[PDB]
Amino acid sequence: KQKNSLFNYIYSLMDVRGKFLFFSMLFITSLSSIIISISPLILAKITDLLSGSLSNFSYEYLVLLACLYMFCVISNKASVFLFMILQSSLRINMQKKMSLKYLRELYNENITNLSKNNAGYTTQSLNQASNDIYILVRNVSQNILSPVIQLISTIVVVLSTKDWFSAGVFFLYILVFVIFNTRLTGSLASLRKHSMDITLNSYSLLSDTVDNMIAAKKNNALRLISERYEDALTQENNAQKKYWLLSSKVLLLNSLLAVILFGSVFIYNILGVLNGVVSIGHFIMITSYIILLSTPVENIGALLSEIRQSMSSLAGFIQRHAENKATSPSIPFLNMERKLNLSIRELSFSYSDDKKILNSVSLDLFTGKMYSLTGPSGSGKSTLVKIISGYYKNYFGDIYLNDISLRNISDEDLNDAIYYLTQDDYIFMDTLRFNLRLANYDASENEIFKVLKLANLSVVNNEPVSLDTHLINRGNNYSGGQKQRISLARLFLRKPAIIIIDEATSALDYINESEILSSIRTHFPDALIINISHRINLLECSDCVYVLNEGNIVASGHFRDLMVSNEYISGLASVT
Amino acid sequence: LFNYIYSLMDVRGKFLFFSMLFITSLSSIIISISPLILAKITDLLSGSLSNFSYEYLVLLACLYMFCVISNKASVFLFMILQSSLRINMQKKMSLKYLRELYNENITNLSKNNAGYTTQSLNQASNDIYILVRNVSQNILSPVIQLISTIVVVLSTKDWFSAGVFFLYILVFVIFNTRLTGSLASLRKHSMDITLNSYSLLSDTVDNMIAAKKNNALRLISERYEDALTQENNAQKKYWLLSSKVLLLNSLLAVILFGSVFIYNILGVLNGVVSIGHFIMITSYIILLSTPVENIGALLSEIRQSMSSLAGFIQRHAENKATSPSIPFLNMERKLNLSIRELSFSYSDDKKILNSVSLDLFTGKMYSLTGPSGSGKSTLVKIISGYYKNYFGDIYLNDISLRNISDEDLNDAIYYLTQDDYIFMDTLRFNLRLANYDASENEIFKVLKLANLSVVNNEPVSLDTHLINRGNNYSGGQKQRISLARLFLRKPAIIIIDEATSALDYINESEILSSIRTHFPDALIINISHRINLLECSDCVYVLNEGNIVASGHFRDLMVSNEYISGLASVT
Ligand SMILES: Nc1ncnc2c1ncn2[C@@H]1O[C@H](COP(=O)(O)OP(=O)(O)NP(=O)(O)O)[C@@H](O)[C@H]1O
Ligand SMILES: Nc1ncnc2c1ncn2[C@@H]1O[C@H](COP(=O)(O)OP(=O)(O)NP(=O)(O)O)[C@@H](O)[C@H]1O
Ligand SMILES: CCCCCCCCCO[C@@H]1O[C@H](CO)[C@@H](O)[C@H](O)[C@H]1O
Ligand SMILES: CCCCCCCCCO[C@@H]1O[C@H](CO)[C@@H](O)[C@H](O)[C@H]1O
Ligand SMILES: [Mg+2]
Ligand SMILES: [Mg+2]
């Protein structure tokens, strides 16, 4: 069942030009195997015409024979060059379509599955998959029809000249070969997959070390960093050597079998020529067939290995990239209300198992009101807002948005209704314009510049900020606070009902913090605001404060009513 | 270049490489006898065909078989040695890269992402592979087969054949070298765009959650699709030139070798040339394609994998200023900091530090504050040796920073960065980053001082597996990992750049208390917007638009300075 899905996926990557290039590759490979299967006859015809006669034969017929053999050899080589020209053209063609499908497939994945592996890994995963497709495209377009044509014609013709021992041992070889190899193909595929996986692990550890180089540099940790890579490389070499040995043995055993079987057919026809039983023309034809048969035998060996091993390694890739999906019912045409209220009823959550992060959170929040959420680091403030923000769907209990449950809300609509300002910043290595256009694609040059003022990012160091400012990897081109302001400027282009600010202002100074937080409430008057903070001034300003402790909501109401009642907020209000 | 490739080969690597060269050379000697054995077989066919002529035909046919078998055994043996050599050279190549990346400056490291550096290793590994191959296979072997051909065809006194044969190798080597550089440039430019494309994929995948939550599929997809279009166009440009060279080389061969075939046909028809010689000539025309092909590769592949490997060495071994350093420096337990008229720019376009003049001392805690963009991080980064292109001077008890080795500076100063850098590994590994030789107890002791020894009423294991960017942990728990590292280290200066922002007052004060206790003589610079640290410091420094605008005690500043007055009013 998964076998059919695989080839349909490869076929789909080919546009009209892609389908032509693929069929041209199949045709030219097939045509040349027909032509080259003729050539050992031509050689035999040349041999007899000369053998015996003492220069007494048609010199014009020898020239015609020699020219036909040349046409065979030329057309077979033109075919090789034409196939590789078509192959690269098809690689180029299928490449773009393959890569975008991956990016779009990665966008539709869940946050839990995305977080599982880094960029180093996903980047080299595309690499392995692309190459896997390439191999499969080749093995199909080249090693299916062509070796069958050359093997059929060879047994048919040798059978026609009534040589039973030759055609017999020839057919015996293809039989022993196809059996022996298939009885060892899976054993290679498994050893190759296991290797390729360790290779991903190794690219993953390189990108992990390079992304955290500054940390390792400043801790003078070259030895610790170098040794954990050197260990990964050692796991890679050992996995590669294990494949190499099996691969090397199969090749040597297949070579020794060929020498024993085809060697006998060569000795048999030698004795046949020495005892006048067999003609020289025929001897040359059997000798010519033994030599010609190696390439179709090679193309079969390849197919039996390469098709099974690239199908296994490609199966594993499609699995860890299209599998993880619970249900998600969603609503067909939903047009969310400008005013939305939040109702969390007996919400429970665990990231893994054995440990519960949210015990039985029961809350009720309303339009145009600001709420503060606090608690110790590990209580689950981020977790709770992430679930509200649809990061996770494996939760016990229910969450409503004006009667409508989250479970029945499409990820697109939820993201239009709620805007989560994350604890960590996510700045794209691109222009400032690009980072803000992330919030709204259709936004004009003015709408974007207006938003810079609202986030206090219109002027940096007495200089006006350009929308064309190039932003380095992780936006480390900008200060901690300037990073927070990019993410804040995004909110102003968006139009949400709920606004979550998870410690999203921590890097800003008192002036900026207050001015932006002011501008938020001004620009979004009816917006429900959840604010996560460990700071009294941010807790004070709220219409109501919620204290989360070890998963459960332990305290509610006004900050003043809590600053003495509650154990945690009294701990905060220890200073001054 | 070739010395760098040679160095990647250990003793087993050098054997495998020479075995590859030998076997390729030996097989070209053997296969160059082949057209003469075919001639003798054609000669015997037009003879008497006596018992001895039949026996000689068989012994001849056996020698041709030995040629064909030994040539194929050589191909299989070469590919077995090649993969063994690839495996061998692989590890050594990869570590040299990681170690080369560690020795690079922060400014140059920040220039490109992991997606880029990962695929950069890929391209160079493959460029080495190609070079190892074209050298071990396409140098001696085609020369042997081309020499013996002209020698033997010259011996049989066929001038037109050996003439046009030598003419072809001459026109070929000229025509191709004329277009090799044009191919290498088109290939390099393509491979570079390919890096750009892998860079944009890792950039998008690292910030997927942002793009997902902003429903930005179209903007994200469009950007990548543009990069892929820049990739296809760069690839198509190489493809066309590559395809033309191949078709023109093929058409030249058909015209030149086709004439040698027609000439010897007419020679056979007019009794001038024997059939035995006519076969030997076509047998040489057919045999010559593989050495012509290997020269076609050698010419084109050696140049294009040298161009793209030149680039890789340039961007991974250059951009070093000076660094005089110090031979054997043993830094004093007590160190004072003296910044004199410090000025700095990142891209020279704008000044970040105007003329910072400061003086700090042992065992005292100092607070640094100012608006976001003043340059607090910049200043401590320069103190921590992130950047060396600065005007003014920085001393450490008479010794200038310029004369301090990056290893010694990192042992004297410990910078707790604004953003956290958690390794995807065990908690043990993340803490061993600070001190390799640390025992299981030294590490757990440090977990208590970091307030990380217990998470959710459960004792924290040193074997806790930490996901990409440590997102397996809470904002504050991340900060605590970086804080726990400091307790294994032994510095004179301790910089805390907003490194406790994700912590509540209790823990912030509690960890900062255990820092001062465990490091009594340590000079502490604290960057904070909050007041629970500014009030605790021995002196406060206010940075505004590059210049230090206010100094002294916090209480004396919330009277004098409006910024410090307004900040304290947040009570
Ligand atoms: N992806 C994850 N996988 C497993 N456990 C996690 C993950 N993220 C967080 N946790 C744990 O879940 C608990 C609460 O997580 P989180 O919601 O980030 O907390 P928080 O209470 O908001 N803390 P903070 O923001 O630092 O002050 C902590 O004990 C974390 O260790
Ligand atoms: N790597 C960089 N490349 C270019 N400019 C930079 C870089 N890092 C910082 N800057 C700029 O230098 C100035 C000061 O940066 P930084 O030292 O991080 O500031 P900060 O004043 O400490 N702000 P913060 O800690 O966010 O509240 C700002 O104008 C930044 O945009
Ligand atoms: C035009 C009349 C017939 C020509 C004589 C028959 C021999 C055909 C040429 O054989 C070639 O010999 C080479 C070594 O000499 C091999 O490397 C090559 O694989 C093989 O294809
Ligand atoms: C001309 C009379 C003397 C000929 C005696 C030697 C036998 C030549 C065998 O050559 C083989 O012929 C095949 C034909 O298809 C090619 O595929 C193959 O590469 C080549 O090796
Ligand atoms: Mg949190
Ligand atoms: Mg800073």
Side-chain angles (χ1 to χ4, degrees), chain B residues 201-241:
Chain B
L201 174 77
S202 70
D203 179 58
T204 307
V205 180
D206 284 323
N207 303 336
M208 189 75 266
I209 320 87
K212 269 175 73 67
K213 294 298 114 181
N214 284 243
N215 293 138
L217 181 57
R218 177 177 182 203
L219 191 86
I220 269 330
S221 191
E222 286 196 11
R223 179 174 77 156
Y224 195 36
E225 179 177 10
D226 299 318
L228 296 176
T229 294
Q230 281 114 50
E231 221 190 16
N232 284 0
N233 299 349
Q235 282 167 344
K236 286 183 171 78
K237 272 186 255 180
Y238 182 81
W239 187 88
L240 272 142
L241 202 66

Side-chain angles (χ1 to χ4, degrees), chain A residues 50-52 54 57 77 81 85 88-89 92 96 100 104 107 109 118-119 123-124 127 203-204 206-228 233-234 237 240-241 244 248 255 266 270 280 283 290 298 355 377-378 389 391 412 415 419 423 426-430 434 437-439 441 461-463 474 479-482 485 494 503 507-511 534-535 537 550 568 571, chain B residues 45 47 49 54 57 61-62 65 76 80 83-84 87 90-91 94-95 98-99 101-102 104 113-114 117-119 122 198-199 201-203 205-210 212-224 228-229 232 239 243 250 275 278 293 350 371-373 384 386 407 410-411 414 418 421-425 429 432-434 436 456-458 469 474-476 480 489 498 502 504 506 529-530 545 563 566-567 570:
Chain A
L50 311 159
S51 84
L54 289 120
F57 44 76
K77 195 141 236 307
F81 293 166
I85 260 153
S88 45
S89 204
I92 284 148
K96 179 168 165 203
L100 276 159
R104 297 191 142 245
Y107 175 96
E109 218 156 319
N118 55 47
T123 257
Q124 207 58 214
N127 230 275
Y203 271 95
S204 177
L206 174 76
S207 70
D208 180 58
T209 50
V210 179
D211 283 323
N212 304 335
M213 189 75 264
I214 320 88
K217 268 176 75 65
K218 294 299 114 183
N219 283 247
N220 293 139
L222 180 58
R223 178 178 180 189
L224 190 84
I225 269 331
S226 194
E227 291 188 359
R228 84 151 183 181
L233 297 176
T234 294
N237 285 0
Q240 282 166 344
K241 287 182 171 77
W244 187 88
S248 297
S255 289
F266 189 68
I270 276 158
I280 298 145
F283 166 70
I290 291 160
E298 284 183 285
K355 343 263 194 169
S377 185
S389 314
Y391 272 44
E412 162 124 49
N415 291 340
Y419 194 82
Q423 241 187 290
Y426 293 102
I427 282 87
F428 281 80
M429 176 180 66
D430 215 307
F434 178 91
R437 278 188 76 225
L438 186 90
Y441 184 99
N461 301 314
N462 272 333
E463 284 276 76
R474 297 200 190 179
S479 84
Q482 283 163 345
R485 286 186 253 161
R494 224 94 220 281
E503 287 179 70
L508 300 154
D509 54 276
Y510 80 97
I511 302 156
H534 289 298
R535 290 174 284 130
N537 58 306
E550 278 205 313
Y568 181 73
Chain B
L45 295 184
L49 295 178
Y54 270 103
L57 189 104
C62 286
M65 207 59 180
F76 293 167
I80 260 153
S83 45
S84 203
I87 284 149
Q90 207 147 78
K91 180 167 157 198
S94 286
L95 276 159
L98 188 74
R99 296 191 149 250
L101 278 182
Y102 175 95
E104 218 157 320
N113 55 48
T117 73
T118 257
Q119 207 58 214
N122 230 275
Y198 272 95
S199 176
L201 174 77
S202 70
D203 179 58
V205 180
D206 284 323
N207 303 336
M208 189 75 266
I209 320 87
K212 269 175 73 67
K213 294 298 114 181
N214 284 243
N215 293 138
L217 181 57
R218 177 177 182 203
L219 191 86
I220 269 330
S221 191
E222 286 196 11
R223 179 174 77 156
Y224 195 36
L228 296 176
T229 294
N232 284 0
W239 187 88
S243 296
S250 290
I275 298 143
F278 167 71
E293 283 185 283
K350 283 110 181 174
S372 183
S384 318
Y386 271 44
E407 298 176 325
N410 292 340
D411 292 310
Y414 194 82
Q418 240 187 288
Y421 294 86
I422 282 88
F423 280 80
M424 176 179 69
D425 215 307
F429 178 91
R432 278 188 77 224
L433 186 89
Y436 184 99
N456 301 314
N457 273 334
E458 284 276 76
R469 297 200 186 182
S474 84
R480 293 192 256 203
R489 223 94 220 283
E498 286 179 71
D504 55 33
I506 298 156
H529 282 128
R530 291 163 166 193
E545 279 206 317
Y563 181 81
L567 175 59
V570 181

Side-chain angles (χ1 to χ4, degrees), chain A residues 36 39-40 43 46-47 50 69 284 287-288 291-292, chain B residues 38 41-42 45 64 68 279:
Chain A
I36 212 71
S39 61
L43 227 43
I46 282 161
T47 298
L50 311 159
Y69 187 87
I284 257 73
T287 302
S288 294
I291 290 141
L292 159 144
Chain B
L38 253 270
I41 288 157
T42 306
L45 295 184
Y64 186 85
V68 142
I279 282 351

